[PDB]
Design an enzyme around this catalytic site. Sequence first.
Site, PDB file in Angstrom:
ATOM      1  N   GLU A  15       0.830  -1.203   0.000  1.00  0.00           N
ATOM      2  CA  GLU A  15       0.000   0.000   0.000  1.00  0.00           C
ATOM      3  C   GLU A  15       0.862   1.249   0.000  1.00  0.00           C
ATOM      4  O   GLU A  15       0.549   2.215  -0.721  1.00  0.00           O
ATOM      5  CB  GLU A  15      -0.956  -0.020   1.137  1.00  0.00           C
ATOM      6  N   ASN A  41      -7.570   9.292  -5.716  1.00  0.00           N
ATOM      7  CA  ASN A  41      -8.385   8.364  -6.467  1.00  0.00           C
ATOM      8  C   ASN A  41      -9.298   9.121  -7.447  1.00  0.00           C
ATOM      9  O   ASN A  41      -9.606  10.306  -7.307  1.00  0.00           O
ATOM     10  CB  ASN A  41      -9.225   7.572  -5.462  1.00  0.00           C
ATOM     11  N   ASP A  80     -12.507   9.097  -7.992  1.00  0.00           N
ATOM     12  CA  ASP A  80     -13.709   9.663  -7.412  1.00  0.00           C
ATOM     13  C   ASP A  80     -13.517  10.944  -6.633  1.00  0.00           C
ATOM     14  O   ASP A  80     -14.485  11.419  -6.000  1.00  0.00           O
ATOM     15  CB  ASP A  80     -14.495   8.564  -6.653  1.00  0.00           C
ATOM     16  N   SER A 104     -11.636  11.151  -3.831  1.00  0.00           N
ATOM     17  CA  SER A 104     -11.089  10.802  -2.515  1.00  0.00           C
ATOM     18  C   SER A 104      -9.583  10.671  -2.652  1.00  0.00           C
ATOM     19  O   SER A 104      -9.020  10.604  -3.788  1.00  0.00           O
ATOM     20  CB  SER A 104     -11.727   9.542  -2.014  1.00  0.00           C
ATOM     21  N   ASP A 116      -6.256   8.399  -0.588  1.00  0.00           N
ATOM     22  CA  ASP A 116      -5.795   7.388   0.376  1.00  0.00           C
ATOM     23  C   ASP A 116      -4.628   7.924   1.230  1.00  0.00           C
ATOM     24  O   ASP A 116      -3.739   8.543   0.664  1.00  0.00           O
ATOM     25  CB  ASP A 116      -5.322   6.172  -0.350  1.00  0.00           C
ATOM     26  N   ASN A 144      -8.973   5.475   2.922  1.00  0.00           N
ATOM     27  CA  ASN A 144      -9.617   6.408   1.997  1.00  0.00           C
ATOM     28  C   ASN A 144     -10.511   7.436   2.668  1.00  0.00           C
ATOM     29  O   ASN A 144     -11.252   7.146   3.613  1.00  0.00           O
ATOM     30  CB  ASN A 144     -10.383   5.550   0.976  1.00  0.00           C
TER      31      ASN A 144
END
EC number: 3.2.1.17
Length: 129
Positions: free
Chosen positions: A35, A46, A48, A50, A52, A59
Amino acid sequence: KVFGRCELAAAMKRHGLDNYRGYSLGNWVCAAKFESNFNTQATNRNTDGSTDYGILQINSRWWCNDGRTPGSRNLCNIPCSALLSSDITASVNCAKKIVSDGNGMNAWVAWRNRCKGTDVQAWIRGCRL
């Protein structure tokens, strides 16, 4: 902070992730590796809108508040910046919620794609735990 492998294993153990929801410590270290490369300060946007955050790339749509994410729920009740600290407490607490959410560790697509089904205990080899 960029953790060493065994350093992060020990911290995660101390905070109660070894066998949490039945996922052995190696699963959590493997997830962190892929990750974030063990870097608490890792961030990734991301599609959308958002982002991380942190060692487990949590998120901002469902879990943490970053002030800029459509549809945010802040279910961990924390600012997303808390997930970038050298102190992994907030990430661990929020990861405990996530993995309890229904889909277990499949909530981490890097875990599903790179750790699930593999010899995850290799990730705690050599450590004094």
